[PDB]
Design a protein around this ligand. Structure first.
Ligand SMILES: Cn1cc(-c2ccc3nnc(Sc4ccc5ncccc5c4)n3n2)cn1
Ligand SMILES: [Cl-]
Length: 281
């Protein structure tokens, strides 16, 4: 029930965030059409968008951090990274985050869907797109911390966008050994998660370590274990996954190396090997 006067904001920051701000007459939010996220329309040209309605922000410092995140995220521009279209801050501190509409939803549900018929080539292609997204994010010194198939999205062109970061924001079965032990995250721990994401792809969305207790992952891994090679995962791609899970963080490949290696493996396929679901998954 706290009142907030937005005019108490620093005029320099308000000026700095203007290119991120969407005018009230530029966006028609379809509160009737619910995806808390709603369908929206943006003008440029009618543009379909996803409008994430955040909880009301009643602290000027929090409003300030919201506007600052918006500015930084606005410059995270890449074909395989979810873009911020802009932000709205309504009267009384009610925020809207405007993101591009993702027609085919999250990548995990997409590959799981038994009516979709992915090939080995399709699935590796998805992995490659994610690696390109991550190569970009790493170049910006941005550590994702929650990379997973569920956290990537697909548009109408089947372009994969790394999402669930910034204003679009423990996953222990995607976490590197050193992160489980120290609670610190790096680009090299994102590479570990990317390895698990590749496993998710080649299994068409199977949960990693099915019979394994969430609380018991460090002890499991320390017995000398890794995720098994999926039935439809090519040997060189499984070798890549094993490199992503190297016990020495510094010995794991960079995302730039992953893009290179995966592009090569991808190139050898012609879209003739269909990927079917594991009976046990
Ligand atoms: C199961 N699931 C995971 C997600 C998801 C993932 C990452 C992520 N990063 N930002 C968002 S919000 C968003 C953004 C665009 C959308 N486009 C279409 C439908 C839903 C949409 C939701 N997400 N949403 C949605 N369902
Ligand atoms: Cl294929």
């Amino acid at each position: 029930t706290v009142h907030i006067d937005l005019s108490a904001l620093n005029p320099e920051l308000v000026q700095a965030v203007q290119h991120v701000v969407i005018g009230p007459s530029s966006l028609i939010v379809h509160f009737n059409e619910v995806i808390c996220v709603y369908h929206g329309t943006l003008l440029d040209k009618k543009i379909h968008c996803a409008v994430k309605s955040l909880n009301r922000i009643t602290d000027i410092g929090e409003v300030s951090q919201f506007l600052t995140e918006g500015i930084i995220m606005k410059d995270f521009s890449h074909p395989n990274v979810l873009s911020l279209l802009g932000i709205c801050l309504r009267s009384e501190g009610s925020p809207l985050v405007v993101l591009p509409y993702m027609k085919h939803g999250d990548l995990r549900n997409f590959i799981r869907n038994e009516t979709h018929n992915p090939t080995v080539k399709d699935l590796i292609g998805f992995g490659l797109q994610v690696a390109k997204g991550m190569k970009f994010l790493a170049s910006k010194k941005f550590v994702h911390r929650d990379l997973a198939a569920r956290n990537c999205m697909l548009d109408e062109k089947f372009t994969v966008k790394v999402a669930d970061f910034g204003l679009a924001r423990l996953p222990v079965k995607w976490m590197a050994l050193e992160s489980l032990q120290t609670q610190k995250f790096t680009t090299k721990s994102d590479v570990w998660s990317f390895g698990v994401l590749l496993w998710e792809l080649m299994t068409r969305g199977a949960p990693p370590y099915p019979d394994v207790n969430t609380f018991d992952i460090t002890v499991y891994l320390l017995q000398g274990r890794r995720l098994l090679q999926p039935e439809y995962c090519p040997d060189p791609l499984y070798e890549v996954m094993l490199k992503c899970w190297h016990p020495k963080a510094e010995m794991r490949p960079s995302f730039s190396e992953l893009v290179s290696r995966i592009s090569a493996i991808f190139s050898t396929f012609i879209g003739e090997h269909y990927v079917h679901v594991n009976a046990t998954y």
